[PDB]
Design a protein around this ligand. Structure first.
Ligand code: CLA
Ligand code: CLA
Ligand code: CLA
Ligand code: CLA
Ligand code: CLA
Ligand code: CLA
Ligand code: CLA
Ligand code: CLA
Ligand SMILES: CCCCCCCCCCCCCCCCCC(=O)OC[C@H](CO[C@@H]1O[C@H](CO)[C@H](O)[C@H](O)[C@H]1O)OC(=O)CCCCCCCCCCCCCCCCC
Ligand SMILES: CC(=O)O[C@H]1CC(C)(C)C(=C=C/C(C)=C/C=C/C=C/C=C(C)/C=C2C=C(/C=C/[C@@]34O[C@]3(C)C[C@@H](O)CC4(C)C)C(=O)O/2)[C@](C)(O)C1
Lengths: 73, 131, 160, 61, 217
């Protein structure tokens, strides 16, 4: 039984200290081990100050938002 | 059984939900729970049900809505009369300039306009609570 | 709407133009309260035309600033342009406080005793209806009288 | 500028300008006082605050 | 098959906005103002409101989209700064009534008088500057105060007015107490006449201060 958002599905970030808070990014993969605290891996078009466009988030920090659309983060 | 991160998060949620309810009670005694701090004064609840309780208007809490409405309109009339009869009609400036004295009735009445404003506010607050 | 107070001797349910054949109970209560209030106002009004005319004419001023005196104010229609306007607005106030001190207990005007403004009712229903009908008949007559005194005042200069 | 940015949702198009599209938007900008208002009232200019980064966190504990 | 996330590991999302209570609280009890929780419905209820007629199209005529600004409030600052269509209709009919009175007032005062005399564009400023038997200003102002203190339009700003817009319950001589009488048609005629009187009053006001603007005075 798959857990978390599907691969390639857009999710809105709910981590307040994240550089992409309330932004959206494609789900690269979700780790299926229940022992992993932050299994969801999300990649973004906008890099942060460390020039990193991907990060691993918790299961409770992604809400499966729709596609961004024209001129929308 | 091993404690997965989901189980730890579940314990976090249970602990927070229980403790946030417990600390509101009479068994936590934090300085932020003193009188003059966040909680309302014991016998004088200000806001309940998202409506100004009758205790907001202080000593007027026992007044009826009709009494407050009558006082509000009467004070509005008297204070507006005083202001208009002191500023524009029957000016007192020339009379007091030549050594005279103010018409004390005008001065006393003119202070009843903001009193009337807050009186009609209190009338509405009383009407909301059904008093 | 017959069997309600108001139908006594010279006419029964009087309505020539209807206005109550609809049977709206809420409408009748408001009309009844209006009819009684007008009468009650008119009855004091008819007293207000008789007394200052013949005598009384309260000693004093009623306006110390304008130097008016009660004797100066003409009786009847001409007063409402001679009584200082501050007096009329205060009459509206004294009416209002009693409009919000004479609270209504049931459906139609009540809660003052015979005219006692805590007095109690007339108890015996025969007197309860007889006095209530007497108030209505007196009030209606005064209503017709005060407009007649208004017309008489206009027709013949002063109030009489 | 806003029209070009909306129609080129890529960083590659900001360093290497799509000149035909750029001049197309430049010529199309004359009707801005009407198109901009029609976008304002029809919910196509602004974006709800819950879709862009509000700012730094000020609380959590 | 995707496993359902337990409530322990669910998400808060951002359904909780600045216009509503947060996790658990009650909003501030404001007196008569925008109260209660707003919901987007202005444009939708605007397409059901009557007033549209064949002079301009036949559907809901609103270029500039002033109706929709309430629905946008949620996108903008998430605050109902712009009124709902219910408040807009209340303003519609209030302006219409006031104009239908005011236009014939302008006409009558230029041809009628009572026992002070001063133009029409300076009649009020004169009456507010020379009281001799002019308690009529007091009576008119207290009537206005009582009327729109009693008939203050509830919570029309956020579209939650229980009273139908413009329905003050003033139908003394049973003019349209009929079950429908096409009450839509009577209301439409009222709105058309109110708009016409608004245009007339605007024409007169703009002409008196811009000479030769509107044909005839
Ligand atoms: C403000 C003035 C006023 C008002 C509101 C009323 C109101 C009323 N009168 Mg009335 N009346 C008045 C002045 C007034 N009266 C005067 C001045 C007279 C003297 C001519 C009468 C003589 C009169 C009679 C003889 C009767 C009424 C009756 C009524 C009631 C039913 C008639 C109706 O539909 O009313 C409009 C109603 C409560 C009837 C009643 O009591 O019904 C039970 C009735 O039989 N009236
Ligand atoms: C209890 C409060 C109260 C107070 C302080 C006053 C005070 C006053 N009243 Mg008054 N009045 C009251 C209650 C009160 N009244 C009540 C309950 C009534 C019954 C309706 C009246 C009816 C009344 C009349 C009819 C008139 C006054 C007038 C006046 C003023 C006369 C002095 C003057 O001419 O200038 C110094 C004076 C300031 C007179 C006035 O304002 O004339 C300009 C006037 O004509 N009063
Ligand atoms: C002179 C004729 C007259 C008569 C016969 C009455 C008779 C009556 N009035 Mg009345 N009244 C009168 C003139 C009169 N009034 C005037 C001129 C006024 C103006 C001040 C009033 C103001 C008045 C009030 C304010 C009330 C009465 C009430 C009553 C009734 C007493 C309560 C009762 O019996 O049932 C019980 C009684 C039938 C009371 C009533 O209707 O029921 C309580 C009441 O509340 N009267
Ligand atoms: C019960 C009330 C009442 C009484 C006793 C009178 C009494 C009188 N009226 Mg009268 N009147 C009344 C009500 C009343 N009126 C009403 C309600 C109206 C309005 C329709 C009039 C309109 C009226 C006129 C137009 C005239 C009278 C005239 C008269 C006198 C003859 C007499 C003194 C006449 C009069 O006084 O002539 C000098 C006269 O010309 N009345
Ligand atoms: C928006 C409405 C409006 C407003 C704010 C005013 C305001 C004013 N009018 Mg005016 N008037 C109006 C409508 C209005 N009028 C209409 C519709 C007429 C035609 C009947 C008149 C006829 C009129 C005359 C003849 C005079 C005034 C005058 C005045 C001034 C003194 C107050 C007075 O005595 O009014 C009196 C107003 C009336 C008698 C009209 C009342 C009709 C109401 C508005 C309709 C109610 C309908 C109701 C449901 C039945 C004051 C600035 C006086 C003035 O100073 O002249 C410059 C004056 O001599 N007015
Ligand atoms: C229903 C209650 C009521 C009563 C008893 C009065 C009574 C009065 N009004 Mg009045 N008035 C009323 C309602 C009322 N009005 C309403 C609803 C309006 C519309 C806002 C007005 C507008 C009005 C004006 C504009 C004027 C009066 C004036 C007057 C006085 C002259 C007498 C008269 O009207 O000739 C019968 C009188 C005291 C006049 C005045 O100043 O008298 C000194 C005056 O100029 N009234
Ligand atoms: C700070 C302004 C303010 C506030 C918060 C209130 C609040 C209230 N008024 Mg109110 N009122 C005000 C000013 C205000 N009033 C003024 C200036 C007047 C004219 C003198 C009135 C006349 C009035 C009446 C007649 C009644 C109320 C009533 C009420 C209550 C409920 C109905 C309501 O809000 O509709 C009225 C709301 C308004 C008229 C909105 C005006 C205020 C807005 C918010 C802002 C105005 C300031 C700006 C211009 C240098 C190129 C409520 C407590 C009713 C009640 O139950 O009171 C007892 C009622 O019947 N008001
Ligand atoms: C073109 C004139 C016109 C028309 C057609 C209407 C039509 C209407 N008005 Mg309206 N009104 C008008 C002018 C008009 N009004 C003006 C100038 C005022 C200011 C005094 C008002 C004040 C007013 C109030 C305060 C109320 C209405 C209401 C109503 C509705 C029920 C009353 C009725 O049977 O209609 C009257 C039909 C006529 C033919 C009258 C014209 C006679 C000349 C109806 C849609 C009531 C309602 O429910 O609103 C939705 C209500 O409470 N009106
Ligand atoms: C008190 C409440 C207890 C309950 C009793 C209640 C009825 C009171 C009515 C009397 C009015 C209050 C008296 C204030 C003194 C006063 O009027 O001075 C009398 C003053 C006049 O004052 C005199 O005027 C002279 C004129 O030349 C000079 O200027 C003098 O110097 C000045 O003293 O007049 C007024 O203040 C007029 C305004 C009255 C406004 C009342 C209208 C409101 C009516 C509706 C309200 C209820 C509606 C619900
Ligand atoms: C379906 C239906 O019917 O619904 C209706 C039913 C209801 C509820 C009953 C109803 C009502 C009530 C109504 C109409 C009230 C009517 C009011 C009438 C007012 C009367 C007045 C002003 C009296 C006068 C007296 C005057 C005197 C004038 C003179 O002194 C003058 C100057 C000069 C003198 O030389 C000559 C003079 C001649 C002596 C004057 O000029 O005026 C309502 C609300 O309308 C709805």
């Amino acid at each position: 039984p798959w857990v978390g958002p599907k691969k390639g599905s857009w999710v809105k970030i709910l981590r307040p200290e994240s550089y992409w808070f309330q932004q959206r990014g494609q789900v690269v993969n979700v780790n299926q081990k229940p022992e992993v605290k932050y299994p969801v891996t999300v990649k973004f078009d906008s890099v942060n100050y460390a020039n990193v466009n991907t990060n691993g988030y918790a299961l409770w920090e992604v809400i499966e938002a729709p596609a961004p659309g024209p001129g929308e983060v | 059984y091993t404690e997965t991160v989901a189980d730890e998060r579940l314990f976090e949620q249970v602990y927070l939900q229980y403790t946030s309810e417990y600390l509101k009670g009479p068994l936590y005694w934090h300085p932020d729970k003193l009188q003059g701090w966040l909680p309302d004064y014991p016998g004088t609840p200000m806001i309940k049900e998202g409506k100004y309780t009758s205790h907001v208007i202080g000593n007027l809490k026992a007044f009826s809505s009709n009494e407050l409405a009558f006082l509000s309109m009467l004070f509005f009339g008297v204070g507006l009369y005083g202001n208009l009869q002191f500023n524009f009609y029957d000016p007192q400036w020339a009379k007091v300039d030549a050594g005279g004295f103010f018409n004390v009735s005008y001065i006393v009445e003119s202070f009843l306009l903001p009193i009337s404003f807050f009186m009609h506010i209190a009338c509405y607050i009383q009407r909301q609570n059904g008093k | 709407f017959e069997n309600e107070l108001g139908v006594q001797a010279p006419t029964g349910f009087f309505d020539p133009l209807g206005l109550s054949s609809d049977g709206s109970i809420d409408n009748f209560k408001r009309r009844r309260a209006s009819e009684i209030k007008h009468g009650r106002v008119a009855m004091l009004a008819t007293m207000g035309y008789m007394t200052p005319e013949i005598t009384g004419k309260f000693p004093g001023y009623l306006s110390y600033s304008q130097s008016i005196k009660f004797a100066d104010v003409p009786n009847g229609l001409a007063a409402m342009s001679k009584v200082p306007v501050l007096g009329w607005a205060q009459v509206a106030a004294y009416g209002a406080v009693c409009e919000l001190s004479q609270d209504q207990s049931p459906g139609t005007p009540g809660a003052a005793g015979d005219f006692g403004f805590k007095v109690i009712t007339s108890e015996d229903e025969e007197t309860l209806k007889r006095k209530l009908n007497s108030e209505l008949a007196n009030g209606r007559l005064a209503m017709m009288a005060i407009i007649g005194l208004f017309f008489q005042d206009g027709l013949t200069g002063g109030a009489y | 500028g806003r029209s070009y940015l909306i129609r080129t949702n890529d960083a590659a198009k900001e360093i290497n300008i799509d000149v035909p599209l750029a001049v197309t938007c430049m010529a199309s900008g004359f009707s801005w006082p009407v198109a901009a208002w029609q976008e304002i009232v029809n919910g196509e200019m602004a974006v709800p605050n819950d879709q862009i980064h509000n700012g730094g966190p000020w609380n959590q504990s | 098959x995707x496993x359902x996330x337990x409530x322990x590991x669910x998400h808060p999302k951002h359904m909780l906005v600045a216009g509503v209570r947060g996790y658990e609280m009650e909003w501030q009890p404001i007196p008569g103002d925008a109260v209660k929780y707003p919901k987007p419905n202005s444009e939708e209820m605007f397409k059901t409101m009557i007033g549209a007629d064949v002079e301009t199209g036949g559907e809901a005529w609103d270029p500039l989209g002033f109706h929709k600004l309430f629905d946008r409030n949620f996108d903008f600052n998430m605050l109902p700064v712009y009124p709902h269509v219910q408040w807009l209709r209340e303003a519609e009919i209030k302006h219409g009534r006031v104009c239908m009175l005011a236009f014939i007032g302008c006409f009558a005062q230029a041809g009628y008088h009572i026992g002070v005399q001063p133009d029409w564009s300076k009649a009020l400023a004169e009456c507010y500057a020379s009281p001799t038997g002019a308690v009529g200003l007091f009576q008119i102002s207290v009537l206005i105060g009582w009327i729109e203190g009693k008939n203050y339009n509830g919570d029309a700003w956020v579209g939650m007015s229980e009273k139908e817009p413009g329905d003050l319950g003033f139908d003394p001589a049973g003019f349209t107490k009929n079950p429908d009488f096409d009450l839509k048609k009577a209301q439409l005629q009222e709105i058309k006449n109110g708009r016409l009187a608004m245009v007339g009053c605007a024409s007169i006001a703009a002409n008196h201060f811009i000479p030769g603007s509107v044909p005839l005075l």
